[PDB]
Amino acid sequence: QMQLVQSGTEVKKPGESLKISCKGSGYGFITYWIGWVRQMPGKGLEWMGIIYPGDSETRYSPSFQGQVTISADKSINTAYLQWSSLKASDTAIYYCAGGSGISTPMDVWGQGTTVTVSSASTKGPSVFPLAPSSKSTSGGTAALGCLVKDYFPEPVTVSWNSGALTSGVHTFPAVLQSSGLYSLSSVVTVPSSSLGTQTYICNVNHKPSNTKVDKKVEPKSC
Amino acid sequence: EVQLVESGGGLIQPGGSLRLSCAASGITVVRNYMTWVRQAPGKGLEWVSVIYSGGTTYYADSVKGRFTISRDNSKNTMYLQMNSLRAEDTAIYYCARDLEVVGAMDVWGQGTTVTVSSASTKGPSVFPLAPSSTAALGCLVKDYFPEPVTVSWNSGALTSGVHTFPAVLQSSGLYSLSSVVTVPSSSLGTQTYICNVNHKPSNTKVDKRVEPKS
Amino acid sequence: DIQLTQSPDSLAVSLGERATINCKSSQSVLYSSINKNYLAWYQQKPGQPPKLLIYWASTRESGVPDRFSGSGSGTDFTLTISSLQAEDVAVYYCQQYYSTPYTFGQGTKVEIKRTVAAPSVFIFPPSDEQLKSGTASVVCLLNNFYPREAKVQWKVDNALQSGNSQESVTEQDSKDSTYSLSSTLTLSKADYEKHKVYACEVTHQGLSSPVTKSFNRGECS
Amino acid sequence: EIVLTQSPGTLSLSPGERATLSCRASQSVPSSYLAWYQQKPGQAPRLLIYGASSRATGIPDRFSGSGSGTDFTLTISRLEPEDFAVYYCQQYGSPMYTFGQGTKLEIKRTVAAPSVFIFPPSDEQLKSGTASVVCLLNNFYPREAKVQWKVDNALQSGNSQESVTEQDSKDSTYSLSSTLTLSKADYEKHKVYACEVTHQGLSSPVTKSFNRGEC
Amino acid sequence: TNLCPFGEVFNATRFASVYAWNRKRISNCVADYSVLYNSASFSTFKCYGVSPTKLNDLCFTNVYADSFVIRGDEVRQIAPGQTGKIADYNYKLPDDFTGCVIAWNSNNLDSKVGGNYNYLYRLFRKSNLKPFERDISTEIYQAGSTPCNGVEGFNCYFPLQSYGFQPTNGVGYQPYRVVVLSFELLHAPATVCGPK
Ligand SMILES: *[C@@H]1O[C@H](CO[C@@H]2O[C@@H](C)[C@@H](O)[C@@H](O)[C@@H]2O)[C@@H](O[C@@H]2O[C@H](CO)[C@@H](O[C@@H]3O[C@H](CO)[C@@H](O)[C@H](O[C@H]4O[C@H](CO)[C@@H](O)[C@H](O)[C@@H]4O)[C@@H]3O)[C@H](O)[C@H]2NC(C)=O)[C@H](O)[C@H]1NC(C)=O
C-alpha cells in the first residue's frame, strides 16, 4: 500500500503562473492513475482530469480542457497541474487522488494544496479587543473576545492564555472583506466573578507576516 | 493502365470549401492505404492525410478538424472535403497509394491545383515586343489572374529558339509573363510571327502579331 | 457528461438513528461483463481530505465501521448509516466512475439533530483603538443555538441596513452540538457618529420574540 | 515528430559523374522505413528507392540507397540527362509521414555569356496608362547575373522584377527576363532607357539602351 | 486450491507474434496478483475497469491471459477505443473492457542482430477486426482489381510483414512483450479466486 504527498500552500497575484505537484511513495505505483480534484471555498468537489504517469495519457474534464495542463514524470512518481494565467477565481484547495485503474475509485488521496490568488500584498493583522459589558449578570456568566481585523494571507492561529485555556472557546471562520483582506473574530464565555481577578489574553500567530500579537482584554474602566 | 486521376481544385475564397477527387483504375482504394500529399508553390512536399483499408484515418496538424477523407468504391474514388480554407492551404494536391514496407507511394496522381484567394478572375492583355536594328522578338502577357496561361508561336509551328519565362506576381495582385523567341535577322519582312496566348479561366484567346516598327 | 444528484442537501438526524442519503444518476452504469455498477461514496470532514468509504455499490473499504451500507441498482443508489455516531458527522459525496469525465454529487451535509436551543446574544461597540484607524465594526454574537438558521438585521437609529453586513458561523460544537454566529457591521467613523442607537435584531426558532441587545454610542453600556 | 534534413540544398555535377545525396534524421529511424523520391519540373514525384536500398520497379541499376541510424544516402553512380531534377527523402516509421527539404540537381556546363536585348513599351500599351520596358538575357550560364536599370543614367530600384527559365534541355542554359514598370507620365519625363548586364562571361559589363521616341 | 500459472505466461521463453496471439484460460486455481502489481520489470501497467490492488478479494468465472509482441510505439494502441495497424488488423480490445495491459521492453531477448524474422504483423486487411478476433490468414491480398490466385506480385501482397527487430533501433522501435488479463463473470460458478 502506497500514499500520496502534495506540495505546500501557494499565494500568487492574478496573472502569474503556477505548477503544483503530487508525488507518490510506496510499492505498487506503476498501476496508479492520478487525478486532480478542485474544491472552491465551501463548495463541492470537481474532477478536473486524470493522467497515467507511465505514458502520460491524459484525459481532462470538459470544464478544464485548455484552462490547465496535467503532466507527469514517471522517473520520480510525480503528477503535475499547472496554470498559464492564474485568475482570482482559481482560489481553492486542490487534491490529487489516485485510483489503481482507469475505471476505479480513488482509494488514495493527497493532503491538499491550498492556493490563494489575490492582488493583495502580505499584511499582518491588527487586533482590537472585545471588553465585557457593564450590563452583565454578576451572578451569571459573561462573554468577551478578540477581533483580528485586516490580515493576508490566511491563516491565523488564536489561543487563549498560551494554551492554558481551551474550554468554552469559539474561534470563528474568517470572512474575505471587499478590500481583499481577511477578518476573524475569537470569543470565550467566562464567569463574571473572575472579571476582576483573572487576566484574559488572546494569542494571535500569523506566520506569513512573522507577526505575534498579545492583546489585553479587561472590562472598559469608564 | 494503373492510374490515379485527380479533379477537385481551382480558385476559392478563404473560409471556403472544396471537395477533391482521386478516381482509380486497376487499384481498389477500399483495399489500400491511401494518402494525400500537397506541395505549396515553390516549396517542397507535405503529408496531409491517410485512409486505412478499414476506414481508420489520420491527419496532419495544420489540417485536423478541417479536412476529411472519404471513399466510394462504386466509382472507385477517394474524396477529401476541405473547409475553412486559408491562404497557406494554396498548394498543388497529390493523392497516392502507399504500400508501407512493401514499397511506398508507388502510384501518384497528376495533381489538382488549389488557390485560396479572394481576387477576381481577369484575362490578359497581350502586347508586342518589337525587334530592332540574329534578332529577338516576343509578346508580353500582362495583368492576368489566376494562373496559368500558355504561349505558342505560329499556332504551334515555331518551337526552336523560344523561351517563355515563368509568371511573376506583381504588387497589383495580377500575374504577368513575357515570352520571346530568337529569330534569323534576315527573315523578318518575309516570315510573319504570331503569338497565341490562351488563358483558360477567362476563355481568352488572343492572337497578336509581332512586326519590326518603322 | 454523466449528471449526478444527491438527496437531500442537509439531513439533520439524531444520535443512533438511520440516515438515508439518496443519489440519482442519468445512465445505466452496469458493466454487463461483471454486472457490477461503478459508483463510490466518499466522506470528508471539514479540513480533511475525502476518505473513500464505499467502492462499487455495496463493497466496503477496509477499516470502516459496519454501520455504513450501500444499496441500489440501475440508476438509483443509496448510502445508509444504521446507528449514527458523533464521529461520523461530515459531508457525503457520491461519484460515478463508468467513464471519463468522472462526476460527483452536490453533497449532503449530515449533522446531529438535538433539541432546539435559543442563542445567547451579545453586542460589543467598537474599541477606540480600532476607531483610530478610520472605520468602525460593531460585532454581534449568537452563542450555542440550534438549528443553524438565524437572521441578523442591523438597525442604525431604527434605519434598516442592507449591503454592509457580513456573517460567519462556527462548525457544530463537538461537546454540546451547538452553533455560534458572528455578524460584523463595518462602517465609516463619519457614518458611525451620525447616529446614536445601534441595535442588532436576531430572529431564531428558539426565541419567542426577536431579542435585541443594543448600546448607546459614548455612554458606558 | 521526426525531422529529415537534406544536404546539400543545391548541387551541380556533370553528366556521368557520381552524385551523393544525403538525408539525416532528428531521431534514429530504422533503415527499413525510409524512401527516396524524384520529381521533375511540372510533374509529380516518382518513387526511386523503397526501403533504404531497394530499387522500386523500373528504376535503373545506377540509383542506389544506403545508410542507417540517422544518416542515409542516395547515390547515382553515373549521371544521365533524365537524372537532373529535385530529389526528396521521406520517413514512414510513424503514420505522421515527413519529407526532406529536397536537393536540386543541376547540370554543370562551360561559362556562356548572354546575348542582351531591350524592348521599349508598345504604343498600344502606352494608350492604357503604363509602360513596361523588358530586357532579355538569352542562353547564358551560370545563372548568376546582375541586371541594373538606368533611366537617364540614374540607377532604378524597386520597380524592376525578373524571372529565370529552368535550364533548356538542349543546351543546359538559362534565360532571364527583367521588366521595369512605370506610368506613362513617368515614362515621358525621361529620354535614355538602358539595361546594364554584369556576368562572369563578360569581361566588362554589357549595356543595351534606347531613346524614347525611336530617337 | 492450487496456484495459478501466471508464471507460465509472463516468463515464457518464446512469445507469439501479434497476428497469431496466444490465449491462456486460467481456472481452478487461486492466484496472487500482488507479484504482478509490485514488480519493477513492467514499463506499462494499465488496468481498464478493475483496481489490480483489491483484486485478490474477488473471484471470477474465467480469467484470460492473452500474450504477444509488438513494437514499443504500438503498446499505447492496446487499449479500448484505439486505432492503428495493430488495433484494426492484429489485436482489438472491446470498449467495455474489464482488464489490465502489461508491457516490458525485451530488446535483449527478441532482437537478433541481422533481423528476427520470426515476428510478424498483419499489414493488409480489408476489414477491421472485431474485439478479441484472431486472424491467421496467409491468403495473398488482392489490392488491385485483378485476382492473384495464389501468386504474389504487383497488387498481390503477402498479408504479413516482419517487424525485423534489431537492437540498435531506437527505444520506440524495439520489441515489447505484452500480456493482457481479461476478467469475465457469468452467473456461473467462480473458480479463479485469491488468497485467504
Ligand atoms: C518471472 O520471473 C522473475 C524472475 O525469475 C526468477 O528466476 C527464475 C530462473 C526462477 O528461479 C524463479 O523462481 C525466479 O523468481 C520473478 O521475479 C522474482 O520473484 C520472486 C518471487 O516470486 C522474488 O523472490 C523474492 O526475493 C526477495 C529477495 O531475495 C525476498 O525478500 C522475497 O520475500 C521473502 O521474505 C518475506 C518476509 O516476510 C517472506 O514472507 C517470504 O516468504 C519470502 O521468503 C521473495 O522471496 C525474486 O527476488 C524475483 N527476482 C527477480 C530478479 O525479479 C517473477 O516473479 C516471475 N513472474 C511470474 C509471473 O512468475
Side-chain angles (χ1 to χ4, degrees), chain B residues 39 44-45 47 94 98 100 104-105 108 127 130 136 142 163 165-166 168-169 182 208 213-214, chain D residues 37 39 43-45 47 88 92 97 99 119 123-125 132 136 138-139 161 163-165 175 214:
Chain B
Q39 192 181 12
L45 299 147
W47 178 82
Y94 306 99
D98 66 340
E100 184 147 341
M105 271 155 208
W108 276 87
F127 295 98
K142 206 175 181 304
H163 285 103
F165 310 88
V168 292
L169 194 128
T182 313
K208 194 74 156 52
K213 175 173 303 223
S214 45
Chain D
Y37 294 95
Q39 185 186 19
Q43 271 173 42
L47 170 61
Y88 297 86
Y92 47 108
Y97 289 178
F99 284 85
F119 304 97
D123 300 304
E124 199 203 291
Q125 181 183 357
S132 298
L136 166 62
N138 192 31
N139 293 333
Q161 263 184 1
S163 207
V164 177
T165 62
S175 304
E214 203 193 19

Short mmCIF file of all heavy atoms in Angstrom, two decimals, chain B residues 39 44-45 47 94 98 100 104-105 108 127 130 136 142 163 165-166 168-169 182 208 213-214, chain D residues 37 39 43-45 47 88 92 97 99 119 123-125 132 136 138-139 161 163-165 175 214:
data_model
loop_
_atom_site.label_atom_id
_atom_site.label_comp_id
_atom_site.label_asym_id
_atom_site.label_seq_id
_atom_site.Cartn_x
_atom_site.Cartn_y
_atom_site.Cartn_z
N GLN B 39 1.88 20.12 -52.23
CA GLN B 39 3.12 20.85 -52.48
C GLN B 39 2.78 22.33 -52.65
O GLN B 39 2.28 22.74 -53.71
CB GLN B 39 3.82 20.32 -53.72
CG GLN B 39 5.23 20.78 -53.94
CD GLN B 39 5.85 20.21 -55.23
OE1 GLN B 39 5.15 19.64 -56.08
NE2 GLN B 39 7.17 20.39 -55.38
N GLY B 44 8.53 22.46 -50.88
CA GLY B 44 8.59 21.01 -51.02
C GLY B 44 7.28 20.33 -50.64
O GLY B 44 6.23 20.98 -50.54
N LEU B 45 7.35 19.01 -50.41
CA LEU B 45 6.14 18.21 -50.22
C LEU B 45 5.79 18.07 -48.75
O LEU B 45 6.66 18.05 -47.89
CB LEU B 45 6.27 16.82 -50.81
CG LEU B 45 6.53 16.82 -52.30
CD1 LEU B 45 7.41 15.65 -52.72
CD2 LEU B 45 5.22 16.84 -53.06
N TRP B 47 2.95 16.02 -45.98
CA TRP B 47 1.95 14.97 -45.81
C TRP B 47 0.64 15.59 -45.31
O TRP B 47 0.64 16.64 -44.66
CB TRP B 47 2.45 13.92 -44.86
CG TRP B 47 1.51 12.87 -44.61
CD1 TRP B 47 1.29 11.80 -45.39
CD2 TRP B 47 0.63 12.73 -43.47
NE1 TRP B 47 0.33 10.98 -44.82
CE2 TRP B 47 -0.09 11.54 -43.64
CE3 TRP B 47 0.40 13.50 -42.33
CZ2 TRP B 47 -1.05 11.08 -42.71
CZ3 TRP B 47 -0.56 13.05 -41.40
CH2 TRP B 47 -1.27 11.85 -41.61
N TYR B 94 -1.56 16.24 -54.46
CA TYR B 94 -1.48 14.86 -54.93
C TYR B 94 -2.19 13.93 -53.95
O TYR B 94 -2.07 14.10 -52.73
CB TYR B 94 -0.02 14.45 -55.06
CG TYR B 94 0.79 15.37 -55.90
CD1 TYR B 94 1.59 16.33 -55.34
CD2 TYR B 94 0.81 15.23 -57.26
CE1 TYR B 94 2.36 17.16 -56.12
CE2 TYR B 94 1.55 16.05 -58.04
CZ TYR B 94 2.32 17.01 -57.48
OH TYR B 94 3.04 17.81 -58.33
N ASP B 98 0.23 4.29 -50.68
CA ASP B 98 1.48 3.74 -50.17
C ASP B 98 1.29 2.25 -49.88
O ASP B 98 0.16 1.77 -49.68
CB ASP B 98 2.04 4.47 -48.92
CG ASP B 98 1.18 4.35 -47.68
OD1 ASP B 98 -0.01 4.03 -47.83
OD2 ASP B 98 1.71 4.55 -46.55
N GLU B 100 3.51 0.97 -47.57
CA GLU B 100 4.40 0.92 -46.41
C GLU B 100 5.71 0.17 -46.70
O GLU B 100 6.43 0.54 -47.62
CB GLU B 100 3.67 0.32 -45.22
CG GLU B 100 4.50 0.33 -43.96
CD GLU B 100 3.67 0.49 -42.76
OE1 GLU B 100 2.50 0.97 -42.90
OE2 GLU B 100 4.20 0.13 -41.67
N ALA B 104 6.69 2.32 -51.18
CA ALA B 104 5.91 3.46 -50.64
C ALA B 104 5.46 4.39 -51.74
O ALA B 104 6.31 4.84 -52.51
CB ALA B 104 6.71 4.18 -49.60
N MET B 105 4.18 4.71 -51.78
CA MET B 105 3.72 5.71 -52.76
C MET B 105 4.23 5.34 -54.14
O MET B 105 4.90 6.15 -54.76
CB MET B 105 4.18 7.11 -52.34
CG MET B 105 3.20 7.80 -51.43
SD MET B 105 3.98 9.06 -50.40
CE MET B 105 2.88 9.04 -48.99
N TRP B 108 1.24 7.59 -58.18
CA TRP B 108 0.99 9.00 -57.80
C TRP B 108 0.06 9.65 -58.83
O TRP B 108 0.21 9.35 -60.02
CB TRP B 108 2.33 9.76 -57.78
CG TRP B 108 3.16 9.67 -56.54
CD1 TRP B 108 4.07 8.71 -56.23
CD2 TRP B 108 3.22 10.64 -55.48
NE1 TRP B 108 4.67 8.99 -55.04
CE2 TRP B 108 4.17 10.17 -54.55
CE3 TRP B 108 2.56 11.84 -55.22
CZ2 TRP B 108 4.47 10.86 -53.38
CZ3 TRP B 108 2.86 12.52 -54.06
CH2 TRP B 108 3.80 12.03 -53.16
N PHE B 127 0.83 42.27 -75.60
CA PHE B 127 1.50 43.44 -76.16
C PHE B 127 2.75 43.01 -76.89
O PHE B 127 3.37 41.99 -76.54
CB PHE B 127 1.90 44.44 -75.06
CG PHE B 127 0.75 45.06 -74.36
CD1 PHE B 127 0.33 44.57 -73.14
CD2 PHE B 127 0.05 46.10 -74.92
CE1 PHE B 127 -0.74 45.14 -72.46
CE2 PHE B 127 -1.00 46.66 -74.24
CZ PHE B 127 -1.40 46.18 -73.01
N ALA B 130 8.90 44.42 -79.92
CA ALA B 130 9.29 44.56 -81.31
C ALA B 130 10.80 44.40 -81.47
O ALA B 130 11.57 44.93 -80.66
CB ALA B 130 8.85 45.93 -81.83
N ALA B 136 15.86 39.33 -81.97
CA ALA B 136 15.00 38.80 -80.91
C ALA B 136 13.69 39.57 -80.86
O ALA B 136 13.69 40.80 -81.00
CB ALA B 136 15.66 38.90 -79.54
N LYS B 142 0.14 40.49 -69.78
CA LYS B 142 0.14 41.27 -68.53
C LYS B 142 -1.21 41.31 -67.85
O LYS B 142 -2.21 41.15 -68.53
CB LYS B 142 0.60 42.70 -68.83
CG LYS B 142 1.23 43.44 -67.66
CD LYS B 142 1.77 44.80 -68.02
CE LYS B 142 2.40 45.48 -66.83
NZ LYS B 142 1.44 45.59 -65.71
N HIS B 163 11.87 30.94 -75.57
CA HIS B 163 11.87 30.86 -74.12
C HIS B 163 10.66 31.65 -73.63
O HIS B 163 10.40 32.76 -74.11
CB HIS B 163 13.18 31.40 -73.52
CG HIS B 163 14.34 30.46 -73.67
ND1 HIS B 163 15.33 30.66 -74.60
CD2 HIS B 163 14.65 29.32 -73.01
CE1 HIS B 163 16.21 29.68 -74.51
NE2 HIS B 163 15.83 28.86 -73.55
N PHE B 165 9.19 32.63 -70.13
CA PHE B 165 9.60 32.69 -68.74
C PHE B 165 8.41 32.48 -67.82
O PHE B 165 7.26 32.61 -68.25
CB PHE B 165 10.24 34.03 -68.42
CG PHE B 165 11.28 34.43 -69.39
CD1 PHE B 165 10.95 35.13 -70.53
CD2 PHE B 165 12.59 34.13 -69.15
CE1 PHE B 165 11.93 35.50 -71.43
CE2 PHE B 165 13.56 34.49 -70.04
CZ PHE B 165 13.23 35.17 -71.19
N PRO B 166 8.65 32.16 -66.56
CA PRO B 166 7.53 31.93 -65.65
C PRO B 166 6.94 33.24 -65.17
O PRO B 166 7.57 34.31 -65.20
CB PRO B 166 8.16 31.17 -64.49
CG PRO B 166 9.49 30.76 -64.99
CD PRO B 166 9.92 31.78 -65.96
N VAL B 168 5.67 36.14 -62.88
CA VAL B 168 5.91 36.83 -61.63
C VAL B 168 4.59 37.48 -61.20
O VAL B 168 3.93 38.15 -62.00
CB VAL B 168 7.02 37.89 -61.78
CG1 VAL B 168 8.34 37.20 -62.01
CG2 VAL B 168 6.70 38.92 -62.90
N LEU B 169 4.19 37.26 -59.95
CA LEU B 169 3.15 38.09 -59.34
C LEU B 169 3.67 39.50 -59.13
O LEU B 169 4.85 39.72 -58.89
CB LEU B 169 2.73 37.53 -57.98
CG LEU B 169 1.47 38.09 -57.38
CD1 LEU B 169 0.56 36.95 -56.99
CD2 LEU B 169 1.84 38.88 -56.16
N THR B 182 14.18 33.71 -80.50
CA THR B 182 15.28 34.34 -81.20
C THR B 182 15.19 33.91 -82.65
O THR B 182 14.92 32.75 -82.95
CB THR B 182 16.64 33.94 -80.61
OG1 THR B 182 16.59 34.04 -79.19
CG2 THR B 182 17.69 34.93 -81.07
N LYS B 208 -1.74 37.84 -81.34
CA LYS B 208 -1.13 39.13 -81.62
C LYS B 208 0.09 38.94 -82.50
O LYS B 208 0.89 38.02 -82.27
CB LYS B 208 -0.75 39.88 -80.34
CG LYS B 208 -0.42 41.33 -80.59
CD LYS B 208 -1.74 42.08 -80.85
CE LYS B 208 -1.69 43.58 -80.54
NZ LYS B 208 -0.58 44.39 -81.17
N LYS B 213 9.03 47.78 -86.04
CA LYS B 213 8.40 49.08 -86.19
C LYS B 213 9.23 49.99 -87.09
O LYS B 213 10.46 49.91 -87.11
CB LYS B 213 8.21 49.74 -84.83
CG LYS B 213 7.66 51.17 -84.87
CD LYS B 213 7.37 51.62 -83.46
CE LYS B 213 6.40 50.66 -82.77
NZ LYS B 213 5.32 51.31 -81.98
N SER B 214 8.53 50.86 -87.83
CA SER B 214 9.17 51.91 -88.62
C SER B 214 10.30 52.61 -87.85
O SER B 214 10.82 53.66 -88.24
CB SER B 214 8.10 52.92 -89.07
OG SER B 214 7.23 53.26 -88.01
N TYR D 37 12.38 9.86 -53.35
CA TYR D 37 11.55 10.22 -54.50
C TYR D 37 12.26 11.22 -55.41
O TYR D 37 13.05 12.05 -54.95
CB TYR D 37 10.30 10.82 -54.00
CG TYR D 37 9.47 9.83 -53.25
CD1 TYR D 37 9.56 9.76 -51.89
CD2 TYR D 37 8.61 8.95 -53.89
CE1 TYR D 37 8.82 8.88 -51.17
CE2 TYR D 37 7.85 8.05 -53.18
CZ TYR D 37 7.96 8.03 -51.81
OH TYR D 37 7.24 7.15 -51.04
N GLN D 39 11.40 14.20 -58.45
CA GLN D 39 10.33 15.00 -59.02
C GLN D 39 10.92 15.95 -60.06
O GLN D 39 11.76 16.79 -59.72
CB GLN D 39 9.54 15.76 -57.96
CG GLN D 39 8.32 16.50 -58.56
CD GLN D 39 7.62 17.37 -57.53
OE1 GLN D 39 8.19 17.71 -56.49
NE2 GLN D 39 6.39 17.74 -57.81
N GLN D 43 6.03 17.98 -63.11
CA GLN D 43 5.47 16.64 -62.97
C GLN D 43 4.94 16.36 -61.57
O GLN D 43 4.24 17.20 -60.97
CB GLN D 43 6.52 15.63 -63.40
CG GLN D 43 6.43 15.35 -64.88
CD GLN D 43 7.55 14.48 -65.33
OE1 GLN D 43 7.93 13.51 -64.67
NE2 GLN D 43 8.10 14.83 -66.49
N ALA D 44 5.21 15.16 -61.08
CA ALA D 44 4.77 14.66 -59.78
C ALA D 44 5.81 13.65 -59.33
O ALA D 44 6.53 13.09 -60.17
CB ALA D 44 3.39 14.01 -59.86
N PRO D 45 5.93 13.41 -58.03
CA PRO D 45 7.05 12.59 -57.54
C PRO D 45 7.01 11.18 -58.10
O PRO D 45 5.94 10.60 -58.31
CB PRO D 45 6.86 12.60 -56.01
CG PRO D 45 6.10 13.79 -55.72
CD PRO D 45 5.16 13.97 -56.91
N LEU D 47 8.74 7.43 -57.39
CA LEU D 47 9.43 6.64 -56.37
C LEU D 47 10.71 6.02 -56.90
O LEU D 47 10.73 5.55 -58.03
CB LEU D 47 8.52 5.55 -55.83
CG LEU D 47 9.21 4.51 -54.93
CD1 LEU D 47 9.81 5.10 -53.73
CD2 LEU D 47 8.17 3.52 -54.52
N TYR D 88 13.68 14.05 -53.16
CA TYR D 88 13.16 14.19 -51.79
C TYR D 88 13.29 12.85 -51.07
O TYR D 88 13.25 11.80 -51.70
CB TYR D 88 11.67 14.66 -51.75
CG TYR D 88 11.35 16.05 -52.33
CD1 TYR D 88 11.10 16.28 -53.66
CD2 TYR D 88 11.20 17.13 -51.46
CE1 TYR D 88 10.81 17.56 -54.12
CE2 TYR D 88 10.90 18.40 -51.90
CZ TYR D 88 10.71 18.61 -53.23
OH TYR D 88 10.42 19.91 -53.62
N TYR D 92 8.60 6.93 -43.17
CA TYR D 92 7.29 6.33 -42.88
C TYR D 92 7.32 5.39 -41.68
O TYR D 92 6.75 4.28 -41.74
CB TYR D 92 6.72 5.62 -44.10
CG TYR D 92 7.61 4.70 -44.89
CD1 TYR D 92 7.44 3.33 -44.83
CD2 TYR D 92 8.54 5.21 -45.78
CE1 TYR D 92 8.20 2.50 -45.61
CE2 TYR D 92 9.30 4.38 -46.56
CZ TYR D 92 9.14 3.03 -46.48
OH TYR D 92 9.91 2.18 -47.26
N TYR D 97 3.80 10.95 -41.64
CA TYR D 97 4.88 10.95 -42.62
C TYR D 97 5.55 12.33 -42.70
O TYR D 97 4.97 13.34 -42.31
CB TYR D 97 4.31 10.55 -43.98
CG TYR D 97 3.90 9.10 -44.13
CD1 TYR D 97 3.33 8.65 -45.28
CD2 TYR D 97 4.07 8.17 -43.10
CE1 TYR D 97 2.95 7.33 -45.44
CE2 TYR D 97 3.69 6.82 -43.24
CZ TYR D 97 3.12 6.42 -44.43
OH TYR D 97 2.72 5.11 -44.63
N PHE D 99 8.59 14.78 -45.04
CA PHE D 99 9.56 14.82 -46.13
C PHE D 99 10.83 15.58 -45.82
O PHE D 99 10.91 16.36 -44.87
CB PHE D 99 8.89 15.43 -47.36
CG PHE D 99 7.96 14.49 -48.05
CD1 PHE D 99 6.65 14.36 -47.62
CD2 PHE D 99 8.42 13.64 -49.04
CE1 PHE D 99 5.84 13.46 -48.21
CE2 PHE D 99 7.61 12.77 -49.65
CZ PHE D 99 6.32 12.66 -49.24
N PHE D 119 13.61 45.93 -75.06
CA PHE D 119 12.41 46.26 -75.81
C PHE D 119 11.66 47.43 -75.17
O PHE D 119 11.41 47.41 -73.96
CB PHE D 119 11.48 45.04 -75.85
CG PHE D 119 12.12 43.81 -76.42
CD1 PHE D 119 12.65 42.86 -75.58
CD2 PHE D 119 12.26 43.64 -77.78
CE1 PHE D 119 13.24 41.71 -76.10
CE2 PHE D 119 12.88 42.50 -78.30
CZ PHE D 119 13.37 41.54 -77.46
N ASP D 123 3.16 51.25 -78.31
CA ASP D 123 2.21 52.35 -78.26
C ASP D 123 0.81 51.87 -77.88
O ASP D 123 0.06 52.62 -77.25
CB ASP D 123 2.18 53.08 -79.61
CG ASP D 123 3.53 53.67 -80.01
OD1 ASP D 123 4.09 54.47 -79.22
OD2 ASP D 123 4.05 53.32 -81.10
N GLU D 124 0.47 50.62 -78.18
CA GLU D 124 -0.79 50.08 -77.69
C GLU D 124 -0.84 50.15 -76.17
O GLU D 124 -1.86 50.54 -75.59
CB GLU D 124 -1.00 48.65 -78.22
CG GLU D 124 -2.44 48.19 -78.17
CD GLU D 124 -2.61 46.69 -78.13
OE1 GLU D 124 -2.31 46.07 -79.17
OE2 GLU D 124 -3.13 46.13 -77.14
N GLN D 125 0.24 49.71 -75.50
CA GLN D 125 0.31 49.75 -74.04
C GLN D 125 0.38 51.17 -73.48
O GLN D 125 -0.20 51.45 -72.43
CB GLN D 125 1.52 48.98 -73.54
CG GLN D 125 1.57 49.01 -72.03
CD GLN D 125 2.78 48.33 -71.48
OE1 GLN D 125 3.59 47.78 -72.24
NE2 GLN D 125 2.99 48.47 -70.17
N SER D 132 5.98 49.18 -69.94
CA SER D 132 6.86 48.12 -69.45
C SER D 132 8.09 48.02 -70.34
O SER D 132 7.98 47.66 -71.52
CB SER D 132 6.18 46.75 -69.38
OG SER D 132 5.09 46.71 -68.48
N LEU D 136 16.03 41.31 -72.16
CA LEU D 136 16.13 39.87 -72.39
C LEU D 136 17.60 39.48 -72.33
O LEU D 136 18.44 40.14 -72.97
CB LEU D 136 15.60 39.46 -73.76
CG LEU D 136 15.96 38.03 -74.23
CD1 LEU D 136 15.42 36.91 -73.34
CD2 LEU D 136 15.67 37.75 -75.70
N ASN D 138 19.46 35.99 -73.08
CA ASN D 138 19.09 34.69 -73.66
C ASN D 138 20.33 33.80 -73.66
O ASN D 138 21.40 34.23 -74.11
CB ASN D 138 18.49 34.81 -75.06
CG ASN D 138 17.87 33.49 -75.52
OD1 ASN D 138 17.36 32.70 -74.71
ND2 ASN D 138 17.94 33.23 -76.82
N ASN D 139 20.16 32.56 -73.18
CA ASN D 139 21.11 31.46 -73.36
C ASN D 139 22.50 31.74 -72.78
O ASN D 139 23.52 31.73 -73.49
CB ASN D 139 21.21 31.05 -74.83
CG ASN D 139 19.93 30.44 -75.34
OD1 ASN D 139 19.15 29.87 -74.57
ND2 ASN D 139 19.66 30.59 -76.64
N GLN D 161 11.23 43.81 -61.73
CA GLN D 161 11.01 42.39 -61.48
C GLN D 161 11.71 41.53 -62.53
O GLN D 161 11.76 41.92 -63.70
CB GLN D 161 9.53 42.11 -61.45
CG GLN D 161 9.00 42.09 -60.05
CD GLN D 161 7.53 41.74 -60.00
OE1 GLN D 161 6.91 41.48 -61.04
NE2 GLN D 161 6.96 41.76 -58.81
N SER D 163 12.66 37.29 -63.99
CA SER D 163 12.31 35.88 -63.98
C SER D 163 13.40 35.08 -64.69
O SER D 163 14.07 35.59 -65.59
CB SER D 163 11.00 35.70 -64.74
OG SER D 163 10.27 34.58 -64.30
N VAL D 164 13.54 33.79 -64.34
CA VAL D 164 14.61 32.96 -64.89
C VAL D 164 14.00 31.65 -65.41
O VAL D 164 13.14 31.06 -64.74
CB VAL D 164 15.70 32.66 -63.84
CG1 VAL D 164 16.74 31.76 -64.44
CG2 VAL D 164 16.34 33.91 -63.31
N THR D 165 14.41 31.21 -66.60
CA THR D 165 13.93 29.92 -67.05
C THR D 165 14.65 28.76 -66.36
O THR D 165 15.74 28.90 -65.82
CB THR D 165 14.12 29.74 -68.56
OG1 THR D 165 15.52 29.80 -68.88
CG2 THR D 165 13.36 30.79 -69.33
N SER D 175 17.88 31.67 -69.27
CA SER D 175 17.48 32.91 -69.91
C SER D 175 16.75 33.73 -68.86
O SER D 175 16.00 33.19 -68.04
CB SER D 175 16.66 32.67 -71.16
OG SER D 175 17.43 31.86 -72.03
N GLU D 214 11.95 56.50 -80.55
CA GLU D 214 12.81 55.90 -81.59
C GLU D 214 13.91 56.88 -81.99
O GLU D 214 14.54 56.73 -83.04
CB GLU D 214 12.03 55.42 -82.82
CG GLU D 214 12.84 54.33 -83.57
CD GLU D 214 12.33 54.00 -84.96
OE1 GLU D 214 11.57 54.80 -85.55
OE2 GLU D 214 12.70 52.91 -85.47
#
